[PDB]
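Researcher: I need the complex structure. Ligand is 2'-deoxyadenosine-5'-monophosphate. Inputs:
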Amino acid sequence: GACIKQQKFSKNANQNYKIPASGGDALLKYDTHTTLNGRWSNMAPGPPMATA
Amino acid sequence: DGVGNASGDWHCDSTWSEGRVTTTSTRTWVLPTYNNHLYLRIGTTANSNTYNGFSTPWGYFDFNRFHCHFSPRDWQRLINNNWGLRPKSMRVKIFNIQVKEVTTSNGETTVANNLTSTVQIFADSTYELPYVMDAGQEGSFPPFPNDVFMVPQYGYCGVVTGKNQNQTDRNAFYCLEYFPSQMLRTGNNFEVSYQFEKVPFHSMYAHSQSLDRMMNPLLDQYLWHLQSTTTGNSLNQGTATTTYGKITTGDFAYYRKNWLPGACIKQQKFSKNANQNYKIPASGGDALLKYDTHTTLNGRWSNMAPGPPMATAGAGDSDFSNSQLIFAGPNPSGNTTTSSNNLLFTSEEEIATTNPRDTDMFGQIADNNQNATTAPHIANLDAMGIVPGMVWQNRDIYYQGPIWAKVPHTDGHFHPSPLMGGFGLKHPPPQIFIKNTPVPANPNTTFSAARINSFLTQYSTGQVAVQIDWEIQKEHSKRWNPEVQFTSNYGTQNSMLWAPDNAGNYHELRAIGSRFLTHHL
Amino acid sequence: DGVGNASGDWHCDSTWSEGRVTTTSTRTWVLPTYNNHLYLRIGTTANSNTYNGFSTPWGYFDFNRFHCHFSPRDWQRLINNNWGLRPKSMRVKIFNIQVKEVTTSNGETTVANNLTSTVQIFADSTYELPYVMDAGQEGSFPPFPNDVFMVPQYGYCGVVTGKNQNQTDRNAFYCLEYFPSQMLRTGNNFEVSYQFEKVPFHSMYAHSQSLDRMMNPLLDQYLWHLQSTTTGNSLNQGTATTTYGKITTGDFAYYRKNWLPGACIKQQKFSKNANQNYKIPASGGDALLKYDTHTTLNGRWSNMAPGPPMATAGAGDSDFSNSQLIFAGPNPSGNTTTSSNNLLFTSEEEIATTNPRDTDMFGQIADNNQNATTAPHIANLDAMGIVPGMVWQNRDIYYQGPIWAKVPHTDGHFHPSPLMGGFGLKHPPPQIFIKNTPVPANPNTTFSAARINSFLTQYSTGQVAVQIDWEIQKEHSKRWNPEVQFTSNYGTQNSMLWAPDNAGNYHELRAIGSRFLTHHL
Amino acid sequence: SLDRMMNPLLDQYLWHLQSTTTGNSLNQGTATTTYGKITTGDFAYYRKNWLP
Amino acid sequence: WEIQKEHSKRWNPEVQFTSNYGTQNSMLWAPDNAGNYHELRAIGSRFLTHHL
Amino acid sequence: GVVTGKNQNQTDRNAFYCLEYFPSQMLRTGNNFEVSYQFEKVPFHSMYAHSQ
Amino acid sequence: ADNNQNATTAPHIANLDAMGIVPGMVWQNRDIYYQGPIWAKVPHTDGHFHPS
Amino acid sequence: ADNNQNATTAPHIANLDAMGIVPGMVWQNRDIYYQGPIWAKVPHTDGHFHPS
Ligand SMILES: Nc1ncnc2c1ncn2[C@H]1C[C@H](O)[C@@H](COP(=O)(O)O)O1
Ligand SMILES: Nc1ncnc2c1ncn2[C@H]1C[C@H](O)[C@@H](COP(=O)(O)O)O1
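Model: Output:
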C-alpha cells in the first residue's frame, strides 16, 4: 500500500536529537506535516502503515 | 412539408420550478462548404506539437458551454439559491433550412435560393467517431441569442508516434459519408432526444469549515503526543528529555485527525507584474513549456493545465498559475496582449479549505531517522498522489465554461471528473454532424471516369434549438447570518454590463463561478 | 411529392451477422446530355479491331465492381473470417433528383433549376437489350463514398462479319425510347428490387494440400509398375531387363491417382525487366497481338486474357502473363507507363495446388511407341482440354474486381464461371437506364415538319443507393496453427494507405484477393 | 493519443501566459508578460480534461 | 467465455495477427522432427484499434 | 501438406492437425464403439460390356 | 531508479519516502481499539478516497 | 516546478520518476498473452485499488 514516511523517535531520551517544543526549529517542523492555506498540521496518525 | 411553410418556431425560455429548471436556446447558424467538399489529411512534425489527422467537409453543433443555455440572470437564480446542479435530459431540433446558390458574374456576388438542394444531418448516438466536442474549443453557440454563428468544421487527430507525424498501421480513417444520414430540403426538419446518465451534482457551495478545524474548539483530545526531546527553546541544546503531553485545547496543529487534504502537483507561479518575473522566453532551448509543470506521453511534453484540483490565488491577486483558467474580454486584438486587465482570471481559492495550494506544496516530509548524532531533515512534498483518507473538492463550473466532457474509453480511470470543470459522462450528448450536399456544375458531354471536381458554390442557413432539463438541489441550511450572493456591484457605468454597447457588441466582462453559498464539512 | 421535400436519405452501412452481411452504398451522380439527344451508329474497319454498333443518348448505372459495396475494413472482415460468399438479393433507389438549366450569355455560364423537367428511368428486368455491364469497364461507382461520379453513356455492338465493319441483315437496332419508362421530376423517386439466382459460393480459401500429394505418406500402394527396361543409370545401355516393382512409400511421382490437374492453354511469359525481354513492337506485321496466345472468331484475333484458370507467377515476381489482371495506381499519367511499379499485379499462384502453370505446360506426352530399335520421344502439352477426372480451381475475386458476369445466351456453355472472376448469372442484376428528357428551345412560329434540332442545355444530379444481401460461410477448421490473414503491414507512412492524401485524393495502392484462409483437399 | 483528443482545426477560448520576456534567450531581453490565446497548431499548451 | 465483437466505422484495414514467418524448415506452432512442441513467439491480444 | 516447388520447406499455408483436439470416445475392455453412414446417391457402376 | 545507466553511467537509486496509490496496491486499515473511536463522519465534499 | 521563481530567482524543474494517482488520470491495463496467466485472486484485505 501507500506510504508517507514519518519521523522516528526513541523512548530513550539519550538516543534522540535535541528538538525543542517551540521556536523557529520546533518539533512541529520536523514531524511529517501537511499544509492547508499556509497552516501546518501534524500528519497523525496519517495513512495506514505498519509501525513499531 | 413545403417551401412556404416554416418547419419550426423560435423557443428561448427558462422554466423554473422547485427541484427543476428547463432551459431552451434557439440560434441562427450558417454552414459553408468546407475543404471544397474534400477530406484532407493534416499534420506537421513540430517536436511536442507534432500532430496528424484529417479535416472533413462536415461540420457539427456544440452547445457544450454554459452561457449557451443560460442568461446572466438565469445563472444568478441558479447559483444563489441552489447547492447542486446536473442535466437530466436533452433534445435538439434543426429546422427552417435554406440553401443558397451564390454566383459571381461581373465581379460582384449574387445569392439565390436553390430549392431542391439538400443538407445532410446525423447524430452519432453510438459514439463511433472521435469525440471532439469536449476539448474546450471555439465553435459553441454565442451567449447572446441575437448573434448568428458559423458552424465549426469537424476534424480529428490520430496516434502520434514519437515526435514525427508519420502514421503507423494503427491510425484510423473515418469517412462520414459512411454513416446513414437524413437528407433535408427546405421543408424538412431534424430532431433528436438524449437522456443524461446519472451523475453526481456539482457543488455550488463553498465550505464554511476547514478540513483541519473540524473538531470542537472547547475540548481536549484523550490522545497524547511527544512534545519535545529537550528542555529550552533552542535546537541541539539543553538537556535531553522526552516530554510527553496530552493534546490540549488551543493547539490545533497537533490534533489527530481522520482525514487528509487532497492530492497535489506543484505548479509554477507567475506574477501579473512584469518586473517581478524572471525572464523566460516563449520558445528556445529554455522556454516556458520547459518550466511549467508538464507531463510526458511518448516523449512529448504536455502542459499540465489546469491539472488536478488545487486551491489557487484569488482572481484579483498578483500571482497566478496554470491551475487557473483564463478568459478574454473584447479589449485585446490579435490573439495577444501584454496586459492582464484585458483577461478574465478564474480562482479556485474557495477550495482552500480542503485542497492544497497549486503553487505551494502538499506538505513537508521527514527524510531521515534522526538520532543523538543525526539532526532531523525535512523535504518538501511538491507532488503527492492519493493515499487512503484524503478528501478533496473539484474545480468549479463557470458561466463561460464547459458543461461536460467525455470520459475516455479505457479500462481504468480515477474520479472521472473533468479537469476543466463540469460533468464527466461515459455517454455524453451526441455530436450532430451537418454538411452541404455537393451539387455538380455543368459537366462535360463526353464520359470521363475521373471524379467530379467542379461544383456549384453553396451555403446553408437555418435555426437550431436546444432544450435541456436540469435537476437542482435547493439550499437548506440553518446558517443564521446572510450568505454571500452574486450581485451587480458594478456601480455607475457609461455602458452597463451584460448588455450590448453603443455599436451593438455583446461582451462578457466578468467570469462567474457557481460557488457563493456555503456548507459545513 | 414536392420540390421542398427530400425523396430519400443517405444510407451507407454494413450490417454483419453470422451467415449474412448486408452492404449499402449511396453515391452522388451527375448525368449529362449524350450525343446531343441522338442515336449515332459507330464503327471502324480496323483489322481485328473492327467493330460496329450504336451509341445512345441514354446512360446507365453499374455498381458491378466489389469496392463499390465494401470498405477496405469490411473487405478484411469478409476474407479473414469466411470461406465463402455469394449475393442473395439486391435493391436500388434513385432519388433527390435535380435538373439544371445552364445558360451562356456574356461568355460565362450560369446554372439554374428547371423544376418542371423530367428524367427518364427504366430497369431492364427482362434482358431485351444487350448487356454491357459485365465487360470489365469504367463507369462503376467510385470506391470512396464522398466522390461524385458521372453516369456512363450506354452503347452496344453488333455482329462483325469478317474484318469489315459493314452491317448485314442480321444486325439489330435498339431504341430505348421504345421501352416503357418512369418519368421523374424533382419530387419523384425510383426503386427496384432483384433476387439473385442460386449460385455456388466463391472459395475464399487456398488449398493446404497439393493435388498430387493427397495420399498417406507412410504407406505403400498395393499397385505395381514397371521401374526400368534396363540395368544401369544410362539410356540405351546395359542389359535389357523388364524390372517391375511395388510402388513404395517415398516415391510419390509414381503413385497412381484418382484425379488430374485442370485444363491448360499455355500463355506467353514476359519479364518486368526490360532487358530480359525480346524486342516485340506494339504494331506491325509482327506485333505483340501476334505472339500472345489468341483465339480466332470469324478471322479476327482476340487476346486470350485472362483465359481459363491457371496458376501464375506471384505478384512480386519478375515474370508475368496475360493470365494476370493488372490494375493501376494514381502514379501513371496519360494511360501509359514504362514502369511496373505504378501497376497493381494480380497473382493466381494460390491455385498452384490444383492448376497447371499459365506459362509452363500441362505436362509432357509420349509421341511414339518405342521398341528395341526406336527411342522414346516426348512432346510438350501446351494446351490440353478437359478429360474425365480433372479438378481445378477458379480465379480469385479481387476488391477492385468485377462481382458478376452475364452467362451468354447460347445453347451450350461449360462451367459458367466468368474468366475475369466472380459470379456467372443467367439473369444478372438488371441494367438501369437513365436519360435527360429533351426540352426544346424557342421554336419557329411557322410550322415545319422537320424534327426539332434545338434544345435547352441541361443536366441532372441526384443520389443512388444500392443494397445487397450477401450470404457468407464461416470458416470452421481444425487447423491447429495460425492462418495467414490480411493485415496492414505497410509500416510507417508519410501518408497512410486507404485514406485521402494531403490534396484530398483517394487512391487504391494495393490489389487484395479473397484467398488467405486455407482448406484441405 | 490522450493529449491529442481535441479538434485540430479549432482554437481554444482559453488564454495562457506565452512568455515573461522578449527574445529567444533565457534571462535576457525586456521583461514583459505576454499573454496569448491558445491557437490551433500548438497542442502542447492546450488545456485538458484528463491526465496520463 | 463471453466476447464482444468489434464494431467500428474505421474505413481502412486493421492490423491482424497473421503467419508472417515465411518459408521455414520446420513450420512454427507444430511439432518438429523429434516430436517436440515449442512456442517460439509471444502473442498479445491487442491488434484491433479503438478511439479514445 | 502443400509442396512449394521442389523444396520441402513449408510456407505459411501449411496446416497442422492434432487429433487429440477432436472429441473422442474412450473405451475400456467392456466398452464398444459404433457408427452409421448413408451413401449419397451415385450412378450405378456398369458391370456390362457393350455388344455394339 | 533515478537514471538510465549505460556503459559510462553507474546506476543510481533514491528512496521513495512518500508514494501514493498506483493500480494494483492492496493495504490494511488501522485497527480499532477498546479505548478508541467507533466512527467518524465522512466529510461532505465531492470527492473522497477509501473513506475509512 | 521545484520553486517559485522571481526576478532574482531562476525557475528550476525536477523529474517526476514516481507519481501516484490524482483525480483525473486515465490509464490502460497490461495486455493478456497466449502464454500468460488468465486470472489472479484478489488478496483478502480491507482495501485494494483497481484490482487488476
Ligand atoms: N463528474 C463525474 N462524472 C462521473 N463520475 C464522477 C464524477 N465525479 C465523480 N465521479 C465518481 C467518483 C465519485 O466518488 C463518485 C460519486 O458518486 P455519488 O454516489 O453519486 O456521489 O462518482
Ligand atoms: N459462377 C458460376 N455460376 C453458375 N454456375 C456455375 C458457376 N461456377 C460453376 N458453376 C456450375 C458448374 C459447377 O460444377 C456447378 C456447381 O454447383 P454446386 O452444386 O452449387 O456447387 O455449377
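Model: Summary of the prediction. Residues B 199-200, 415-417, 423-424; G 47 surround 2'-deoxyadenosine-5'-monophosphate (ligand 1) (CB under 6 Å).
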